[PDB]
Symmetry: D2
Subunit: 112 residues, 4 copies
Amino acid sequence: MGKLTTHILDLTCGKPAANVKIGLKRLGESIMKEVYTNNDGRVDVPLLAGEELMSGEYVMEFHAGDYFASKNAADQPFLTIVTVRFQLADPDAHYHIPLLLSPFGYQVYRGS
Amino acid sequence: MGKLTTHILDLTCGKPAANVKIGLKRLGESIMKEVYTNNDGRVDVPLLAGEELMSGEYVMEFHAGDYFASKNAADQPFLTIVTVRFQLADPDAHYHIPLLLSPFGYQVYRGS
Amino acid sequence: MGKLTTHILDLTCGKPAANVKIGLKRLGESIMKEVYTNNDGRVDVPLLAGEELMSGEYVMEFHAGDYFASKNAADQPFLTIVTVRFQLADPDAHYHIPLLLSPFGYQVYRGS
Amino acid sequence: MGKLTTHILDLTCGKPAANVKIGLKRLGESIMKEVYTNNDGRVDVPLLAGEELMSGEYVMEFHAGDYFASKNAADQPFLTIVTVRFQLADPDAHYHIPLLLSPFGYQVYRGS
């Protein structure tokens, strides 16, 4: 009954980051899912839920470079893929892990 | 003549994070360097400089889980290894990429 | 039809900050409202809405010192009242201004 | 022998914020100092030091609205004056309180 969700805010304009590609994958393995955020900078279905969600480490790859490119911007951006590693210990908990994005800085947190 | 440096601040106590292990590696490759921060949460020599520093993507692995463990704390911490991917376009520039750390959230930025 | 809301996350434990007192006031004036966050670190009714919400500057006073005290902590905390000034230009917009809190650092943003 | 310093980073471009006006004042009182950051987003002399630095609360007013205006931008910016309240308990300590700035979000912390 666990759940893993995320949301992206573009601090450069104060609006959610729409159409940003996000990749999910277990630590060590390769991509298992690829999603694109909607207009509220979220995704309809949880990135992980039910059986899918198992205790262990994961990595989310936020394609920030592409997002900011479609908004402007260097040919070789400082931030290309924002990588976020974290561990989900409880398989039945609700994990909200938002991302606050700027061209040269970001904030990751266990939201509510 | 380029340079890559970093520094860690523990927002939980307002002091620099001392003795935190940091791993550096080119995107795709495995670890190339392993360092431990001093008492000011920095390292004597730049993580990258001179020939070592070449245009491309890198990843720094901050061992936050171990750091907070030695300071407290769950057996399976939410944040184990804080992964930071970024691209260094100019081989002759000075890149300062600090990390502001908390048990359930962190901030990455291109400092000065 | 405008709306102003906020939410507090305690990055020290990854849970919303419950029962934190928040003060609202127009720039220059004294407090106009005093609220305490619920268990999700939010408040039932918007801090501002309808006629109440008028174009101009405001200030929110998050009583962080008291919150962390009830959770531990210095007699004279570094952060006592986290002050957040901002301007609401459009009286009919929806403003979400969350606060990510830690004992020695915080993040303010125009969320969604 | 205490010291209070600060530094501003513009996360929108990864460069320090130059020529930003900063106001200092004791809680309750009006401005006591007004400074403008140099090209490294800092100021030559500490904002507070020696006798000047006394245990108590202070407030720094970062004129972000003007800074971003000279860089672009709404006539009525969301962030006009970023207000930062904090308490200095020890008169002989070194307090570094940097600001990570973006148009719609900022991070305040007790740096090193």
